[PDB]
């Protein structure tokens, strides 16, 4: 790390995200903090060459151990996942401690901040945006899951938005993990409101379907204007879930965590989805939501199947356009790896006019 002046200019030798390790000199300026936390700091910066804005995520690093988030992001190359341009190591506020720096594409907005606006304004997020955002989320989920990678922290705050192009990019892979059948995992993963019921039951053999539940929670929140399953504790959140889905059957409990099959829980009647949402809520949104928020993990739709849902039919219309006038972003440029789980969905996912 070196200091020049042409305005303060920081120069470092950083390694690119893709390809073999071929570090380049990278210069940037106009650095300012756009995020602090227990994880570390996030800076915005402007690249000297291109003038393009970037986000620099700086976290504490134990050099004796490899960084999981770095190793995961280097594999990822998708239009709905935030791109890792470069990464480098440096020193920070803690003496004799080395920091990992992640240079990512700067994205101005998040799904959270946008939805938060409509809540303050007492309006509802237009269905078109709900479709657009959710579609691109499932698209990114279909991608990472094909690598056997589970995000484990899907929430509106982690869904970056470009308001001008309506492009969504999944970020924050600091909880992501390569899920392998046979090797158990931590159940303390995933953040409040969006945790799958099996996770709340302390299951350690869960799958990537936990992300699909989180996505369902996000979808419901967009239709509702507020989180559907709030609550500080795991019990609190389960009560909310049960107050909507009804008490899970013994078999459903067995699918989540067998250790709870013998306890006699009070039988609570399920609340109809059509009463959970506003009367103006589109039937297909409700239908999609119920196919995501299932007690049994294997019963939940896969991300790819979710993209093919009728709720996203409008996005496959050739004459579709954003409210701001311009065209919708890339939605049909599916790759073979992306369609790896279920190739025949391509007949639906890729409309005839997109093949042109």
């Amino acid at each position: 790390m070196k200091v020049s002046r042409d305005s303060k200019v920081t120069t470092v030798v950083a390694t690119p995200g893709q390809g073999p390790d071929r570090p380049q000199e990278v210069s940037y300026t106009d650095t300012k903090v756009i995020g602090n936390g227990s994880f570390g700091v996030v800076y915005q910066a402007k690249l000297c060459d291109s003038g393009e804005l970037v986000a620099i995520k700086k976290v504490l690093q134990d050099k004796r151990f490899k960084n999981r988030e770095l190793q995961i992001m280097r594999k990822l190359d998708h239009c709905n996942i935030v791109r890792l341009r470069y990464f480098f190591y440096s020193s920070g506020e803690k003496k004799d401690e080395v920091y990992l720096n992640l240079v990512l594409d700067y994205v101005p907005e998040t799904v959270y901040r946008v939805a938060r606006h409509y809540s303050r304004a007492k309006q509802t997020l237009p269905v078109i945006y709900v479709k657009l955002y959710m579609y691109q989320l499932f698209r990114s989920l279909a991608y990472i899951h094909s690598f056997g990678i589970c995000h484990r922290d899907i929430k509106p705050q982690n869904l970056l938005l470009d308001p001008d192009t309506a492009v969504l990019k999944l970020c924050d892979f600091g909880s992501a993990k390569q899920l392998v059948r046979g090797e158990p995992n931590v159940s303390y993963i995933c953040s409040r409101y969006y945790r799958a019921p099996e996770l709340i039951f302390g299951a350690t053999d869960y799958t990537s379907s936990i992300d699909v539940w989180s996505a369902g929670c996000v979808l419901a929140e967009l239709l509702l204007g507020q989180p559907i399953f709030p609550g500080d504790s795991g019990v609190d959140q389960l009560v909310e879930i049960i107050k909507v889905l009804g008490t899970p059957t013994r078999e459903q409990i067995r699918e989540m965590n067998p250790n709870y099959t013998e306890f006699k829980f009070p039988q609570i009647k399920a609340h109809p989805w059509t009463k959970v949402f506003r009367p103006r809520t589109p039937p297909e949104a409700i239908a999609l939501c119920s196919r995501l928020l299932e007690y049994t993990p294997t019963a939940r739709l896969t991300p790819l199947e979710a993209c093919a849902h009728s709720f996203f039919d409008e996005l496959r219309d050739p004459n579709v356009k954003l409210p701001n006038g311009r065209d919708t972003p890339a939605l049909f440029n599916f790759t073979t790896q992306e369609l790896s789980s279920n190739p025949p969905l391509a007949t639906i996912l890729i409309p005839p006019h997109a093949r042109h």
Binding site: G202, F263, K264
Partner: peptide
Amino acid sequence: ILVEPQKFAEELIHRLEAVQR
């Protein structure tokens, strides 16, 4: 936190009984 099944189920049962018609 990582709660044992018995303690967790007890709390959950207590809560569900209160929100039951």
